[PDB]
């Protein structure tokens, strides 16, 4: 079995992005693990994701983002179709009130046990949450364009989202900002990469 | 033309929902307009929500909803297929993970104006956003069950759903707990209501 876990890189105002340090970490512990970081840009996200998709066909995708503000982690259940960007992307291209799939479906719910991710994460100690609005931004738009290759191509198999909150060392001087220790964001996206994998295997095993 | 203009009765402990005093202020303002309160409850909401569409036929329908702890007023654009209460409705029934259509699209666009409902509140003073999640509960369910309908039965003719923040009266007890005067959001809804009848109109021209 192959798994792709996304990140993203540094984006609006802020030097780091811990996505893609969870990445680097979990690629390196786990070798059916691939990695890849996503620029935050429409145009060259949607190449660099489809691509990456084609070339490794993998069986289970989970993208990561970082959530700037949020207090637990976010595992997403709902990724549409549309691009509102709120902020201008890492290229100054702000598009709103675009559809991320001309004549694709209003919107996708995530493949992988998200509820039962959820609940071990918090069995683990780690703050963890269902999210119904992944945003309209790179994020979501990455989520998206991840159900619908499963939904259009059947690869991957399964697939979803989740977002990290600010790791202590990117709020020092941000005023009651929340922030989650690295390695509990760690802990949780190898949760979610295990229980989502374990689904997937038993469903191939009746 | 028809305008139904939807709310609900008070829950969750607050023993006052502000949508109600909207829907009357409005409905005796506005002749075209036809108001009415749905039970904070799944299974007599959906009923009743049901059959006033269908006895009313309404070219236009507006849902509104009082959300908790929301700044400005919020003009949804998702509804989406899922029943997932954070806390029981007033019938005690807290389902979970359950379509609110079995077969029905993950989620459904508000097909009103909503950006231009959004400028124009503001234009005249009103704090108010686009929102891309309705929520699990009472609210997204009228919303979704909305759309559902203008989409297969074919009324209404457009439809979305209009969050509003708490009003003073509601807060004083209430530590860091924001609200908004009765009187912004009576104007905000009555712009979108409108906003959405110009726009519904310059449709039918030419």
């Given at each position: 079995m192959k798994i792709l876990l996304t990140g993203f890189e540094p984006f609006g105002?802020?030097?780091?992005?811990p996505t893609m340090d969870i990445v680097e970490a979990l690629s390196e512990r786990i070798p059916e693990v691939v990695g890849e970081i996503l620029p935050v840009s429409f145009k060259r996200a949607r190449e660099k994701l489809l691509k990456v998709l084609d070339d490794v066909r993998p069986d289970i995708t989970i993208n990561l983002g970082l959530a700037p503000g949020r207090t637990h982690i976010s595992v997403e259940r709902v990724a549409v179709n549309m691009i509102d960007a709120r902020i201008p992307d890492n290229d100054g291209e702000q598009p709103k009130?675009?559809?991320?799939?001309?004549?694709?479906?209003?919107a996708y719910f995530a493949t992988i046990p998200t509820r039962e991710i959820v609940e071990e994460m918090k069995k683990n100690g780690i703050p963890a949450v269902l999210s119904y609005t992944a945003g309209t931004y790179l994020c979501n738009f990455a989520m998206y364009l991840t159900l619908h290759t499963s939904a259009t191509?059947?690869?991957?198999k399964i697939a979803g989202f989740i977002h990290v909150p600010y790791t202590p060392d990117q709020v020092?001087?941000?005023?009651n900002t929340p922030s989650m220790s690295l390695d509990l964001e760690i802990k949780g996206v190898e949760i979610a990469i295990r229980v989502a994998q374990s689904a997937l295997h038993s469903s191939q095993l009746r």
């Open positions: 105002g802020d030097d780091k992005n009130d675009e559809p991320i799939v001309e004549g694709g479906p209003a191509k059947g690869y991957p020092l001087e941000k005023k």
